[PDB]
Amino acid sequence: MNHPVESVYSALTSILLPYMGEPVPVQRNCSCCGRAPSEFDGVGFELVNAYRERVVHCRPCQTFFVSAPELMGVENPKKPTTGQKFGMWSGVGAVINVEDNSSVLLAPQGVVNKLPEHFFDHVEVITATSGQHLEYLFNTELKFPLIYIQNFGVKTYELVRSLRVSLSADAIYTCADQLLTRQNEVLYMLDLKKAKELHQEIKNYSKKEMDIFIRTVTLLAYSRITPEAASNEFKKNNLIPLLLLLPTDPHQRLSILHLLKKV
DNA sequence: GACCCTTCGGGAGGTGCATCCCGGTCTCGCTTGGCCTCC
Ligand SMILES: [Zn+2]
Numbered sequence: 459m460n461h462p463v464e465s466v467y468s469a470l471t472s473i474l475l476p477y478m479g480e481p482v483p484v485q486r487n488c489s490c491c492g493r494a495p496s497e498f499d500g501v502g503f504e505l506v507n508a509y510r511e512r513v514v515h516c517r518p519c520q521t522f523f524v525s526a527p528e529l530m531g532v533e534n535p536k537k538p539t540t541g542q543k544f545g546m547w548s549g550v551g552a553v554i555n556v557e558d559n560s561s562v563l564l565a566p567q568g569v570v571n572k573l574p575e576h577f578f579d580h581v582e583v584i585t586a587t588s589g590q591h592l593e594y595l596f597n598t599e600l601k602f603p604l605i606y607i608q609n610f611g612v613k614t615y616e617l618v619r620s621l622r623v624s625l626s627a628d629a630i631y632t633c634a635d636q637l638l639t640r641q642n643e644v645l646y647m648l649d650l651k652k653a654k655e656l657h658q659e660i661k662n663y664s665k666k667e668m669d670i671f672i673r674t675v676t677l678l679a680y681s682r683i684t685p686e687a688a689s690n691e692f693k694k695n696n697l698i699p700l701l702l703l704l705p706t707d708p709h710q711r712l713s714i715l716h717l718l719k720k721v
Numbered sequence: 722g723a724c725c726c727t728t729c730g731g732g733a734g735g736t737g738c739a740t741c742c743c744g745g746t747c748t749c750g751c752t753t754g755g756c757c758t759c760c
Contacts, residue, residue: 507755525753537754563760612751635751 462621467518469507470561490519531572545614554605611635
C-alpha cells in the first residue's frame with residue numbers, strides 16, 4: 459500500500475485496470491517487488507513469465523506485465539495480440555507526482571506513434587527520448603514528492619526494486635530498471651538543485667570557457683588529465699566559482715555535466 | 722761480472738642515398754510471444 463510501486467500504479471498504470479483482471483488469492487510474498495503479502499490484503503496475481511517461472515505479482519506489480527493492445531498499442535507487429543507493456547518499455551521514462559497522483563510519460567517518437575489516441579486521454583504523453591528526460595526535468599516545475607522512472611526497461615523486477623520516491627530536488631532518484639543498490643545509487647541520483655544553480659552560474663562564462671570547463675571536469679573525472687593540469691586550466695580560465703558548485707563525487711560531477719551538456 | 726741507455730715527427734678524406742602499402746571484426750549481458758518440434 460505505502461510503497462513506490464503503489465504510487466506509480468495509481469498514478470500511471472491504474473489506466474489498465476479494465477484489461478488487468480481479477481486477482482487470485484495467494485499465500486506467498488510477491489516475487490517482483492519482494493514485499494510481504496501483509497499489504498496486498500492477502501490477494502495476488504499468479505503468472506508465468508517467458509522463462510517458465512511461477513511468479514506472484516501484486517496489484518501494482520502485475521500492471522507491468524499486462525498486455526493491453528487496445529490501450530497501449532501493439533509493441534511488435536510480428537506478435538499483434540500482445541501490446542506495449544509498462545514492464546517491457548525501454549527508453550521510456552515517466553514522472554509520477556505522488557501527492558497529485560498525476561503522471562507524465564516521456565516516450566520517444568516511435569512509442570508515441572504506437573500509442574493509440576485513447577491512451578493520451580488517460581495519460582499526458584510528451585514526445586521525448588532518453589536524452590531529453592533531463593531537459594524535461596530541468597525546464598519543468600517538478601512537484602514533490604515524485605517518482606522519476608528514467609527508463610522503464612525490461613528488467614521489471616529491478617525497476618520495481620529500484621523505485622525510490624524523490625522527496626525534493628536535492629536528490630532525484632533516476633530509476634532505470636537497474637537494481638538500485640546502495641552502491642550504484644550515485645549513478646541514479648540526480649541533484650537537480652545543484653545542477654540548476656550551476657547552469658544559472660554557467661551563464662556568466664563564455665561558450666569557450668564553458669566548453670573548457672566541461673572538458674576539463676570530464677577528463678579529470680575519468681582521470682585523463684592530472685589534477686595539477688586541470689587546476690591550471692581552471693585558474694587560467696577563471697573557472698573556480700564553477701568548481702565550488704561541483705560535488706566532490708566524480709560520478710555526481712559526470713551526471714551533472716551530462717545534465718549541462720543536455721540543456 | 723760488473724753497468725751502460727731506451728730517438729724524434731708526419732698526417733688522420735672526400736660522397737651517396739635513407740621505398741613503395743595493406744588493412745583495423747563479430748558481442749553482450751532482456752523479456753516476450755511466434756513458431757516448431759515433441760514427451
Ligand atoms: Zn510486487
